[PDB]
Amino acid sequence: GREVIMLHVGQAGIQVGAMYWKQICAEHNLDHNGAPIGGDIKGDPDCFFMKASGGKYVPRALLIDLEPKVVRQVGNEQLPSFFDPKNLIHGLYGGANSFAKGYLGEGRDMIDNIMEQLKKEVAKCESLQGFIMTHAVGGGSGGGLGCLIMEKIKEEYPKKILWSYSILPSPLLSDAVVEPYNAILSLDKMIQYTDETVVIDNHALFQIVTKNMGIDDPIYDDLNHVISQALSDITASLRFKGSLNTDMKEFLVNLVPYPRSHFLMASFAPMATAEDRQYAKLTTSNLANALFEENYMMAAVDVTKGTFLACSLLFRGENTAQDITNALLDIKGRIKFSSFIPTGIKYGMTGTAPEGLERSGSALINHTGVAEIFNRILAQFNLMFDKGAFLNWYEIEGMSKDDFAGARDNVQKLSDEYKRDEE
Amino acid sequence: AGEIVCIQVGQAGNQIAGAFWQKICAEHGIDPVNGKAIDVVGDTDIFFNTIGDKYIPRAVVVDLEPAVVENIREKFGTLFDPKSIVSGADGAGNNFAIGFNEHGAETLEKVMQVVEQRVSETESIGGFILTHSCGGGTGSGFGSKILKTIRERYPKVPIFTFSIFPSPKISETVVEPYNAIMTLSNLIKYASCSIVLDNEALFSIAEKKLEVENPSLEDLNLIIAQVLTNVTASLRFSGTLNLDLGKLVTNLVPFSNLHFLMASTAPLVLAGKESYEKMTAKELSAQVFGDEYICAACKPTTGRYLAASVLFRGAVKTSDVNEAMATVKEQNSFVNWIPTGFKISKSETSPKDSALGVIMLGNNSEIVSVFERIGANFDRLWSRKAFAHWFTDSGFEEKDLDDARALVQKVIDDYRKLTEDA
Ligand SMILES: Nc1nc2c(ncn2[C@@H]2O[C@H](COP(=O)(O)OP(=O)(O)OP(=O)(O)O)[C@@H](O)[C@H]2O)c(=O)[nH]1
Numbered sequence: 001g002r003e004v005i006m007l008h009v010g011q012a013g014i015q016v017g018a019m020y021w022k023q024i025c026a027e028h029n030l031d032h033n034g035a036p037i038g039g040d041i042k043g044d045p046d047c048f049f050m051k052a053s054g055g056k057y058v059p060r061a062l063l064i065d066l067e068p069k070v071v072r073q074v075g076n077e078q079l080p081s082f083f084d085p086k087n088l089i090h091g092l093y094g095g096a097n098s099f100a101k102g103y104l105g106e107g108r109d110m111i112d113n114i115m116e117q118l119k120k121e122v123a124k125c126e127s128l129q130g131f132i133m134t135h136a137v138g139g140g141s142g143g144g145l146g147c148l149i150m151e152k153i154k155e156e157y158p159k160k161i162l163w164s165y166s167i168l169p170s171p172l173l174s175d176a177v178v179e180p181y182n183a184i185l186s187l188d189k190m191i192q193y194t195d196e197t198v199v200i201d202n203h204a205l206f207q208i209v210t211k212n213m214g215i216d217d218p219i220y221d222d223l224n225h226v227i228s229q230a231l232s233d234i235t236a237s238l239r240f241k242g243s244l245n246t247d248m249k250e251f252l253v254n255l256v257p258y259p260r261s262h263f264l265m266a267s268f269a270p271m272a273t274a275e276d277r278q279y280a281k282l283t284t285s286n287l288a289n290a291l292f293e294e295n296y297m298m299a300a301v302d303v304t305k306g307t308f309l310a311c312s313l314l315f316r317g318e319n320t321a322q323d324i325t326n327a328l329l330d331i332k333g334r335i336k337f338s339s340f341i342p343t344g345i346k347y348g349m350t351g352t353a354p355e356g357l358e359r360s361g362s363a364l365i366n367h368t369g370v371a372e373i374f375n376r377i378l379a380q381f382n383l384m385f386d387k388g389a390f391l392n393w394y395e396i397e398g399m400s401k402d403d404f405a406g407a408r409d410n411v412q413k414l415s416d417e418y419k420r421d422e423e
Numbered sequence: 424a425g426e427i428v429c430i431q432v433g434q435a436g437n438q439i440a441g442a443f444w445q446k447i448c449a450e451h452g453i454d455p456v457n458g459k460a461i462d463v464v465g466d467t468d469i470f471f472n473t474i475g476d477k478y479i480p481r482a483v484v485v486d487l488e489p490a491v492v493e494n495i496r497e498k499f500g501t502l503f504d505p506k507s508i509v510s511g512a513d514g515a516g517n518n519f520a521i522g523f524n525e526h527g528a529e530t531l532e533k534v535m536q537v538v539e540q541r542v543s544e545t546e547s548i549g550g551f552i553l554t555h556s557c558g559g560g561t562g563s564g565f566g567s568k569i570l571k572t573i574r575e576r577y578p579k580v581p582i583f584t585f586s587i588f589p590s591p592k593i594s595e596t597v598v599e600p601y602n603a604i605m606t607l608s609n610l611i612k613y614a615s616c617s618i619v620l621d622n623e624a625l626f627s628i629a630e631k632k633l634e635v636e637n638p639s640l641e642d643l644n645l646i647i648a649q650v651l652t653n654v655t656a657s658l659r660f661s662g663t664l665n666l667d668l669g670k671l672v673t674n675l676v677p678f679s680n681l682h683f684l685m686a687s688t689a690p691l692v693l694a695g696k697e698s699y700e701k702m703t704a705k706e707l708s709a710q711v712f713g714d715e716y717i718c719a720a721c722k723p724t725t726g727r728y729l730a731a732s733v734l735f736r737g738a739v740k741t742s743d744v745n746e747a748m749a750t751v752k753e754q755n756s757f758v759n760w761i762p763t764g765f766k767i768s769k770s771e772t773s774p775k776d777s778a779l780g781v782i783m784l785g786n787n788s789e790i791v792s793v794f795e796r797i798g799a800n801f802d803r804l805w806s807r808k809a810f811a812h813w814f815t816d817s818g819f820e821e822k823d824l825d826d827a828r829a830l831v832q833k834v835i836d837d838y839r840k841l842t843e844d845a
Pocket residue numbers: 009010011012013015016067094095097102135136137138139140141142167168169170173174175176179202220224227665
């Protein structure tokens with residue numbers, strides 16, 4: 001089957017997914033208006049779409065939210081008639097930026113409908129490869145339903161691979177003051193439930209939008225681009241004849257040696273975004289290196305100083321296999337891997353491309369500097385918790401102080417596990 | 424869904440609400456009183472019930488004394504659906520106990536029946552907002568009974584209030600402080616949050632910045648309405664942060680019982696529309712965070728912010744906001760250094776009468792001086808002697824009056840303990 005089901009949870013999740021779906025359709029020559037096809041189909045629809053005999057390619061995804069808003073905007077206005085209505089699942093009240101509400105309160109009833117509807121979708125799949133969930137890490141419902149759903153997925157689908165893509169809050173971009181705690185709870189459960197996750201830091205993206213893209217007054221409408229753009233590239237291998245990680249399982253083999261340390265950084269280029277982006281170079285002598293430059297790091301971590309545990313470097317389009325092979329010669333040695341693993345950057349390419357680009361690429365990097373992301377979040381959390389700020393918004397729903405402590409411990413352990421690999 | 428039911432109690436409530444709903448309608452494009460609307464913009468259904476070539480405020484009016492029902496029936500006009508006006512057989516003097524303890528029981532049943540109607544007509548309740556003064560026989564008497572009975576029915580629905588605290592402006596050596604403390608107690612016990620509007624503060628602002636020699640109480644209300652509309656507007660003209668009423672509650676109040684908020688706005692609009700200022704973010708912030716513009720008369724410039732947020736209404740450049748904010752953070756620090764405690768949001772819908780509205784809300788430790796003033800008045804009339812005029816038949820035992828004082832002292836002590844600047 002090789003089928004993948006996406007679960008878009010909460011506002012960030014559904015909004016980014018909406019953009020993802022618009023772009024995947026373009027790649028496959030599908031019309032946003034219910035995904036009929038403009039003639040022949042390019043790419044492999046078997047991964048993300050139900051191939052209706054009627055010519056309707058049904059995106060296989062759920063749109064899940066506690067607030068009956070983003071689901072209606074997308075179902076009725078942005079991708080009207082694209083997503084199948086039975087898969088638009090929503091509650092009545094949102095959470096007030098509180099994980100506890102998203103996880104312990106609203107949603108406890110809804111989860112049976114979420115999982116039943118997921119079952120219905122899974123049931124018509126020939127065979128799943130896995131699930132991909134998208135959400136804000138620290139979102140009330142994002143971390144809330146997101147984590148609750150993940151738990152139930154692991155119980156119902158014990159042998160399928162669970163991936164997630166999620167967005168971290170930052171000092172400048174955040175709609176909540178209690179994030180940092182929603183975030184460690186969210187992270188904790190993911191450590192316990194996911195097989196692999198890609199984490200994007202809105203801090204990074206800002207910085208990129210602000211200085212590398214040249215866009216002042218940054219807004220979420222642009223940030224969501226760069227997120228969806230990276231996502232459509234990362235998941236691209238699953239849509240085409242190619243090599244390397246052509247299956248979620250192969251990704252796990254290559255990207256997560258040892259347990260728990262499965263937090264990957266996203267690297268993506270070019271950021272054409274919407275600028276004319278005329279390109280006098282696009283040369284592979286730059287692109288291959290660009291994917292190891294801070295300018296394209298959606299994690300806000302310098303890969304220069306740290307130890308790689310894994311790296312999968314994917315190129316697309318017109319790039320010469322030999323030129324890339326030669327390009328890596330000047331990367332290896334700036335990039336170092338742990339002495340306890342098989343080493344080297346694994347790379348390859350698929351000769352297809354998104355509209356507007358002859359050549360492009362991305363990388364999934366697992367390296368010890370991910371610890372710094374966690375360190376920032378934990379520091380904020382530790383201060384919040386120790387003096388009791390905002391505890392009541394959690395305690396009121398039953399989110400005990402003991403769960404705060406539990407998440408504190410597990411997330412701290414991740415950091416410790418990565419730090420010890422530095423030398 | 425995420426809709427708001429507003430409950431308007433007592434004459435002070437009616438007078439503020441009148442100004443409020445007229446201004447809000449104008450901002451959305453809806454003809455106040457009557458005239459339907461024209462090309463309505465903004466998330467109208469949060470506050471209005473669209474009927475069909477008609478919109479009404481999703482609101483409840485409580486007039487214990489029947490003598491004032493015409494202030495809504497005729498003066499507010501046909502804008503507020505008259506079936507939502509609830510009134511009693513008689514009124515109350517300015518004795519909290521009359522409005523609060525076993526009085527108007529039949530009226531109260533009807534009050535809640537009407538609240539329930541506005542709720543059943545709403546897909547989901549994003550919260551409730553109450554508007555009342557704190558010293559009134561109905562205003563806080565019923566206002567407090569209503570606050571409590573609402574929570575009993577809707578324990579998970581936040582109630583936000585905008586309450587007006589009295590000031591004995593002309594030698595009012597009366598029992599009112601008794602009303603004020605008893606309602607303060609109930610606000611602590613049952614509200615999720617509230618804005619503290621102190622008439623004395625506002626008086627000084629009208630006198631000093633609006634240049635009004637002797638504002639009538641009804642003119643003061645214009646400043647109040649300006650604040651109320653611009654604060655409320657964060658939820659109707661969508662901006663850069665995805666806010667709701669429940670979310671505002673989470674972000675501005677880190678502890679139970681420390682939910683009393685200050686409010687400040689700029690530019691103030693002169694009632695006569697006599698002049699306009701250059702709408703510079705820096706200038707606007709300078710006014711908003713100045714002591715001179717604070718509705719609490721507390722001088723927050725000497726305190727510490729437990730939580731805070733700022734909304735800019737209209738088109739302002741990010742590049743100017745950031746410098747204005749840098750100046751503010753250099754002057755007013757935050758409690759426990761919570762790095763996430765200060766939020767800024769923007770939306771393009773400018774207010775009528777200016778290019779930019781700037782609204783600040785915050786939870787600041789100098790707010791205690793409001794409650795300390797109430798306590799002092801209470802003590803002088805209570806610990807010195809039992810001044811209260813035998814409020815015992817449907818009244819309070821000394822212990823109940825002492826309970827209120829005790830709760831108030833606790834809230835004062837807690838703000839003082841959080842901000843010891845160590
Ligand atoms: N990826 C992403 N992050 C966003 C977006 N908008 C805001 N954020 C960030 O996500 C953080 C978590 O809050 P949100 O993601 O808005 O939360 P939510 O998904 O709305 O969750 P609910 O409020 O429960 O519906 C915010 O504080 C911002 O830092 C967006 O469009 N995409």
